[PDB]
Design a binder for this molecule. Structure first.
Ligand SMILES: [Zn+2]
Ligand SMILES: [Zn+2]
Ligand SMILES: [Zn+2]
Length: 72
């Protein structure tokens, strides 16, 4: 697998899976979120303040489903 690493732009949607995130900072970009198991989980979309990055592909950021279809 690979890391997404997408750097969030100010104002861009970010996705936190409440069921799977290890800590509050664990986030997915829209593309990864919708290609992941988390699309059907309890989640929160928050608009980014800019900076940070998508954590898709980080096995320590997710209790389940660390990769999406693109990055696995
Ligand atoms: Zn991503
Ligand atoms: Zn991904
Ligand atoms: Zn989840």
């Amino acid at each position: 697998g690979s890391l997404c690493g997408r750097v969030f732009k100010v104002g861009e949607p970010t996705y936190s899976c409440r069921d799977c995130a290890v800590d509050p900072t664990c986030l997915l970009c829209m593309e990864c979120f919708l290609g992941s198991i988390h699309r059907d989980h309890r989640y929160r979309m928050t608009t980014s303040g800019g900076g940070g990055f998508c954590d898709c592909g980080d096995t320590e950021a997710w209790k389940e489903g660390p990769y999406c279809q693109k990055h696995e």
